[model samples]
Target: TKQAPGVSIITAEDIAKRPPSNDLSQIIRTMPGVNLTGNSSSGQRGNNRQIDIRGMGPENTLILVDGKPVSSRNSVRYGWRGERDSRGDTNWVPADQVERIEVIRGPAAARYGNGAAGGVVNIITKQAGAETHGNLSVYSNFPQHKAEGASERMSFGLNGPLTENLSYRVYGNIAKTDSDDWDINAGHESNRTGKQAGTLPAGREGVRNKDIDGLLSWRLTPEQTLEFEAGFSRQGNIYTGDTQNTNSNNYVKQMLGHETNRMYRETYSVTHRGEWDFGSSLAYLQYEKTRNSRINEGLAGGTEGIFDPNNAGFYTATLRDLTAHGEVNLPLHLGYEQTLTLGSEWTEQKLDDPSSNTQNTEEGGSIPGLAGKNRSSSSSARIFSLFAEDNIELMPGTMLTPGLRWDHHDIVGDNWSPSLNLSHALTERVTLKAGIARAYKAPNLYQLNPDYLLYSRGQGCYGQSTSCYLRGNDGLKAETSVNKELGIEYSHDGLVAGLTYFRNDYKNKIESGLSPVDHASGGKGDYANAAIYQWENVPKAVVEGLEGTLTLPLADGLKWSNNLTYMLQSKNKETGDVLSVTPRYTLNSMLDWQATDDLSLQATVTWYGKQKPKKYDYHGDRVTGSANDQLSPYAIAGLGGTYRLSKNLSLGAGVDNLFDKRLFRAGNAQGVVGIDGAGAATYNEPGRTFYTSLTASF
Candidate 1:
């Protein structure tokens, strides 16, 4: 176990024990003070899996690779799952190329800027050591009950030294995957156009993706290193679109269309780091831009209209990011036993998106813009930040860390963030840690698009006003959060225990506000006093939670680890309900047995308490589901093992959701016709699954 003041590092050895994607999400869900959002499985489409740390949404979280900011666009391996930032669709990075993951929570704004309100996730890649060697691996996935499609991954890598002082590593891999969906059932419906009656049930969540990634590293000197990374991917996933069984003729009553989102992504980055005798310096960073694009397509009324571009709707979102940061450390106070760090960072983010439904009519929905703006619209933001931090030993066995940062956004103005953290060694085996922090988040770029008046018009603003009204806030203010946390950790013999309690107070949390009454798209103009909507900031909100972990060795070669979290929180002023994104109570446990020298077996379990889904509604409400849809408490199990075949080869296998239990979480159910009351929440588990892998090293 490695410990730092406030950072948690997940090592490669720790990563190899879990299954792909699912257990990755599993790993993050166990972290303290975080409310995990999304699901364990994905049609690999839409915003399926992600987390909300300390009740802060994805918009406030920052994602990084090799200390440089990358696209938060939801990758097959990484995603932030925010609404406005739809450009997060890429899966070009392979797990084998990673060395570790560093999670820094609280006001890390001193080290990272802008969306550092929730925290920062830093992905560290493997370096090319002096050893001359290479390896290849193959992996497969299988799901039971005819649920999933075929999925496989093949990877190869080479690491060797060009000279005594120069070494490089190259790794590349290709992956093809398909995810399954839960069984969906619905009531009978009447056909409007042909006077036919039948249930239009939706089944089979679809996901297909192919991605390739490559990485290279060079050791220029013992004190300096340079690295480059590149990736390309093509992905497509399908979800339940809309159910159209009409109550009235030609009008969609209940229908579920198979909707698909396609994406093409490319990435290239270069970074350099160096160490010196007088402290150290991290500088000389050059990063090529990143490109990620997605196409959201829905085939509506295709069974009726012939070649209808309006019926066959499509939306595209493109994103790009360029980033740089440099830091230098110095001896601040010799007598105080302290070190200080001064750093600066600049980032530019740009988005190109098209109006999903710019123009509307009964004949066609979302006519799009004239620039063929139906094709795309553009916006960008630039940010500059300066920061400083000090790590000091205030007294024997007591350490204090304080940091501050200031950022200026080209659009949202500026903000200041600060933090104070203290850690004390109470005894040889016990420690107490506490921290208080202030974090800030600027408004999202797309959030300002409405200011362009895309969704509103003089004719569209029927009840709100007789004006060409605005739908988005261009003058939106930044979000601010104050957080406090206290924790105790104990280690003795082969046993470990830890408990943490945390609270967060938020101001100006951004949310959308609807007007006098609910409104509709398409120029139906059938309203009494409906109004437009815009993004706004809330006055206040509070969230608090408790987290615990326990680990013990049952025998010489056997061990058991468990973690649990209890959440006590407040409601979102805008939605008038608690985040309710995750269950109030959750638990995860693992048992590992080193049965033989090169062989081991492990088992894991995940459990959740009963919860409600009243808060996480889409648009005005669930299009076809009941607001009263409540999720039942459930638990699932997993088993896995690995065996060394020889000095150069290994084999691994695992089973997740061992019992094939059908489970459901908040907002899981979606898409179907004539199934509004209870059928809307059909997002179920992927059932039980089997997977195996083989690796060879040279």
Candidate 2:
């Protein structure tokens, strides 16, 4: 229902107007309450940003394809500072086959179960049609700067009826983006100010994506339908000498222009939907497997992310997930018009990673479990959930939706989420909407496994310790948040406007502990004075923000749409630090003009406010000097147009970063105190670039 104040929809037509280069996060960032940021405020792997809703961070945002959860990113290793060497799960589906994208945020997303404290992005694919149809598309992007990278993509899709009661759909995609030049950051101002000016850090890494999928549907007596689906996708990254600390060796340089890591995902599912006289029912079972293959890296301090000098080739980590879900909807008349929905879901996940489990701890103090040899490298968890929701019409112009969900995890125990949303028509052209809900995220396999260990030298250790060891804790508590939203919308003639205020009370956040365990003795050598810590549930955090949207018809065939998001406050109560490195405020505006029956033109611009840097480093030490600098506000503009050459063909072209506004990364340190840094400008903003696309369809 449109009654939710924190819901947004992007249609296929909107996607066609402004396609992304590689990941959907590029376009999704234009939406209100959304930004591309690292999992934590540290911005360690800044170039590998993901979707952050409000300020809860990327790990709190859940991704779904066709309403099924996508968790391939979980197979990657979780770093000491809450960093991951993987892009998120948003690129699993090609844009050509997408029907619409639903961005649900705030309290409205509480019913989705775990790992949705921030929100959810559900990508719905196009369904099969009765008439046979097919499409083929090709696209290319060229960068203005020679140091920057270029991209190319091709995709094909087909759908048709096979028989009176059967239909099928299939699609495939292949795309690649070249890695930036090795010396792209050599001349940056920050590089000159910092040490080792000649040896510059790398820019954005390139990626290659390949995907294929098919679906078959059967209509039984028009009352029930059954579907079978299978899909496979591969994502490989072209190395650009990127290491966790922005430090590289001969091995890293030698691996440039080659595949350093690759992820292969396979999925199979069976689904059934039936319509009954009293209610409707739906059921589905899905199995997904992700194989993560990459060259082994150091697991100890300073050298943690550098390629392992001992291991020469790639090691594999396999993750498997099985999910089953069932739901039913019933229309009830208990003194009021209402629809009651009930559902249950069960999911199991297992991960096996031998590479990360090989750290020898005998030299450091002896651990109880690993005294003899490393334990099993595999860990698994199961979660079962039941949920119910009701949409009731209390009065002539009032609607209320209340939902409740209960989830039980094998390790993290249980959690209950309750939500309420209301929509009231105050006038013919005005409406009031509000919602409040509880959401939570359970600990991941790496966080819940006691075998997972990370070591650090004095440079990264907390306090005055010479060294330290950070281990996973099986007793970690599940993170929870209470989200609330209120808003008002107005529509009259061709004008639309809205304003929303949202806040989240976040609790039980999991982080590497500052206090060392009492029983564990300090390690050996430089590690003799080392302390032992475990991942623990930290104190409360909060995020508050405002979102505004406006749309107006400027002329006969011209329209303007604009959205603004401002951060009121986002901080951890204990540390008093921002949740993630994001702009204080952001503004996105677009203009669409239909010049002719088959031609259209579009102009867009995005403005970002100054970004503040974290006061403390990853090790909890206060940052000082130039390293605490802030990024100045900036703006980017673009222009694009599409023309229909024929009934079955179209051509499109566009230029991004119209004015060539650009920013380069100076250093990748996690809030280090040094002169060679530009604060939160740990990422690069490429200059003006051009793209062109052609499509043929029936």
Candidate 3:
């Protein structure tokens, strides 16, 4: 069967060749049409980049593990400028335990529903074995510079048949990555008198991870089977004294090398698969809970994200989700070869964020109704969806797939998504494919809660005012996008090539409103002079890009593979700014050689084009001169090899950033330049490093 052009897969063999140090994003970012970027262009938390598909921000990308949603990142608070002080969901699963990762992009991702307007990354895990099998892997990475962070990881996996009708699989992992030195960026800062400041901007933060997962499968009959899975993971962040706006407060400096935030997540799921005479049916129910604990930070202007030592103890926010899904596939011949599929899904998300609403704006008598009010600490929302799709072969070399989905959100009303995809074989070795679809995303819990409020002084406000309030809005509309893509692929005799063009017409994008709120009309007594705003929807935005791939056999047992991506345009019409700061173009190349029956070697290179900053700030103010900084192009290279010591053991080693091309973070603001004349660099790129891994299996 021919798959969709927008679909790409990374196999376990590929991962074994280039094992990630901590997060899977490190490997996935090499895929075509994928990059690591923040949720917004403001660069508030620059080092905590996530998977961004096309030009859509990380907020638009959805992460899935074994077909189940992963929402632990939601437990962290959402802030102004759409920034978060936490790592993304891609790091939940250890690298060696994964079987494969499927990356679906463009129109093909619409069927997955919310937060997938950009795309979807589905991590498929290994299944239990019929025969007993087990493996243990240990890895460590050393950075060239002492100021940079180092990584170490250990993991183990086991699978076996407990009985003729039962099988079990389990995996566990522990990892740590140290934070950069506190004064790593000190040389990059200077005052008007040409003297370095005592406390400069901080460097990248570090992470520690612990995870364990188990799966059990039971066969009730030859044609029917059931599966159950449970998992637990804990992630803690090691502080480097970083804060929004690069604050240098004494309390922030005192907290270096300590735990500032931590997340504990647990998941349970049960699934049933049955094969009948007429069709195949699948059903599943899943539950997830996450507890996010962190030190209290200032929610007001200038002091935002600065830790409060007086409240040094951790405060927690909790998130819980329950999901049920069912689907059926029927094979039929209605004058042609066809397969009809129908599915329904329901989810209820509950959040208890006691810390976000603890602040009182009414203490200054700014708003009368807010006085003496005990805001609710919990919020809940539900979504129900139904969808149908038909895959029909019109002729021997032509196929068409049409689908429709209806979703109802309790607070945001309803939405209908329609999609069409076509594939035609123009030649025996070449195929053409095209697809179009409509996708939508509902507002998050915090964005819909009126009690969730943020205070900002004039510097952070849209207009000149003594102070202002950024409140949540329950009346906001859902974000929608029309995604389109066309591509052609050729495969023959160990050679493969492809080219794709994609575009998205985005509408009703949700953003923190710049316009003041009308409190009087809402029955809340407010002065006309007060500057209060709510989350609102913007009219339009657009993203367009091109992706290309090539693979060829160079010699016996040797091959080369490459992919390139070029972003043509990405802009937010309302603010006249780029959606996110990313490279204009990127190229990834890899060369692999099977040196012998038990040894293999590979080399890789990634080249990135210049990255341009936004023309205007988040508050719609035009940025001029050095404030509108842009990053120069850079390249990184690596060499890796693996040797099988015996039937049950293997050794691996590699060197990354072979040329030692390194970049350091200078400041959080766009106007601030970094060390070595790096114009407005917001993130740090580690220098040359050596890594080694040892694995044992049976």
Candidate 4:
């Protein structure tokens, strides 16, 4: 049966055919309009990576586990540091336990709330199938000029009828992984310089992660069902420089050598869903709760730099989220449907610092207070929302969907969002669609009451001065946007294709700026602060783009797929600057060939265009030009194969970054050599790594 348009699904069979990894983010890289920033360590080890959807920031993207929002109880802010800016918990859900993954692109604020400005990603975990089964797999990887890594995973599932009116199912999974450092470029000047300047130990670093999940479902009656799910994950990695200078050369000979940092996280969630059928309508309710915690640490007093581990410097965080939602589905005129949904959510967070006193007194401890203050600034927030959506069949082959939502935040007042979608079938093999939406992002706790200050070592005209400061803003407003889109989809026999054109206009975009101050010792000075980067009410922005996907079936069970996206964004009403991180082009291709009844081969390639990093100023731009610049383009390729030894047994192997390319994804230039650079460019992607796994089921 064909599903409703606008929905993308990934099944368990798809997951089992891929290489094994502890991070769920790795699996999602194949989806369209979804990009993951930061490297493997950053995603699996807890460093934040901005999740970009349709050119929107991570804070604007909503993530769900089994249809329920998974809140990041930590400070809600959009700065260099905040839950919005931090790596999300997506990596915590191991792919081994997923039954399906669905991505709904475009503005979904009408269904979710605040963060849906970008879109929504929902992960559905595995449930018991018709029969009892279990599987175990082991994987290992060896990369060029690096240590070897290994992982083990296992899962068990079962389902059957307990009685005529009752049924039950259960599923569970456990996985663990440890990796060794792999440096694609050996003895490179850029790598050596970064290690020295950033005071990091020589060599590339690796990571380790562990994940587990369990599910239980019971059918209380013909129309009522109850489910419970629990999940936990912990990841740790040695701190390596995103920039070569910072990790491989800066501290190569230092006594307190720099090494990899470590971070671990654990999460738990439970949900209950039930449905009651009325002759002409159905009513449903869903309730969920999730809690997680992360701890970050580095080698004691290893070096003098931000995030460097010191005897008295360590950070730990805990977050908790609770949500309740209910919806009623009603049948309208022939084949038309309407739904009303209402929900409320609450979240709380806390940070703790036991070494604040010692860390604050160290040579590079000026901002040690940030840790202490954040530890003491625990807070909670609540959100209530009501939404309604209607799907109408206007003609024999045409349909329209329109939705409206209203949300009230205890701190940011009320906001309204709306969306409309129209689809028409031009023929048996072709469809045309168009959509328009309005979305809003509410201010988070950290944005309204942040308590952190940052200072850089300053360089060149902006020489090291203890006076340079970056402060937080307390008065900020919500961001709003309007998006328009048009698309076409085609399918015939074994071929399928889709294309879309879209644009989004933003208002009240919050950005950081400088505040001038008079220095008693010299002339007027400027300090960095979190401020509104708003356009006049007349200030407008535009993001026009096109995306297309093609899939073809070959002879004898072989298939090939390709996805391409091109976009151009400009601040039309303000400076003509291009939006940050908005790549001009992106391409992905994959091939799957079933050579035999029990054997299959797969290959994938991903490409990214060059992009400039967001800029900041230390001495008001007059002295430092722009704080950062653009990065070069790069590409990565992967290959794998799977063989089913028996009806319930299989094995697989593959390699990623087959060519061992060296590229920068993020960072700044320093002395013609960038040090302590963060982002993709700071470090090289692992090169020519190999992995293999085995699985058995009964």
Q: Give the Cα error of residue 522 in candidate 2, in Å.
A: 6.2
Where does model 4 exceed 4 Å of error? 1-7, 38-50, 72-87, 108-110, 147-207, 241-270, 279-305, 308-313, 334-375, 450-474, 516-542, 570-579, 614-634, 664-680
Residue-level lDDT of model 3, residues 98-129, one tens digit each, is: 99999998788988888889999998888777
Over 1-698, each residue of candidate 2 has an lDDT whose tens digit, in order, gives: 22236888888788888878878888887888988888776566677889999988899999999988898999999988888988889888988778888989988888897888899999888877879898898888899997888889898999999999998999999999888887787767354324433455578889899999999999877799999999899999988877777766678878989998999999998999999889999999999999999999988875787788678789999999999999999999888999999999999999999887676665566666644256688999999999999999998789899999999999989899899989999998899999989898999898888888887766666664467778889888899999999999997876889999999999988877777784245456766545778888877989999988888999979989888889899888888877788898999998999999999999999999988877777567877665677889999999999899998999999999999998877666443322344468778898999999888989
Question: For residues 1-698, what per-residue lDDT tens digits would candidate 1 score against the true structure?
Answer: 42232446667656567646422444554555445453211111222445556656555657666666655452211111123313232133455556777767664432466666767767676766668888787778787855444467777778877766666667777665543433232322112123333323233334445555555666578788776667566555554322211112222221222324566666666767677777877763434333333323221221211112344444556666667788888876577898899988887777665543232233222222322124335667877889888989988788898988888888888888888888999987898989888887776664555423333323223234322222446667888888777888887886878887777787887654434222333433442222444566767877777767788999989989877767777566555655435676788788999999999899999887665544333333432335455557788899999899998988889998899986432222322233232322333455688889787988
Candidate closer to the true structure by TM-score (higher is better), 1 or 4: 1
- Highest-scoring model, lDDT: 2
- TM-score for all predictions? 0.82, 0.97, 0.95, 0.79
lDDT for model 3 comes to: 0.83
Ranking of all candidate structures by their lDDT, best first: 2, 3, 1, 4
**Candidate 4 C-alpha lDDT tens digits along 124-198:** 865555554555555555565444334555555555455554444454455544433333233332322433443
Stretches off by above 4 angstroms in model 2 are 1-4, 189-198, 669-678
Off by over 4 Å in 3: 1-4, 189-197, 362-365, 368-373, 463-466, 519-529, 671-680
Clashing pairs in 2: 523-528
Best by TM-score: 2
Candidate 3 least-lDDT 10 residues: 671-680
lDDT of each: 0.57, 0.84, 0.83, 0.51
Candidate 3, residue 463: the lDDT equals 52
- Looking at model 1, residue 646 earns an lDDT score of 96
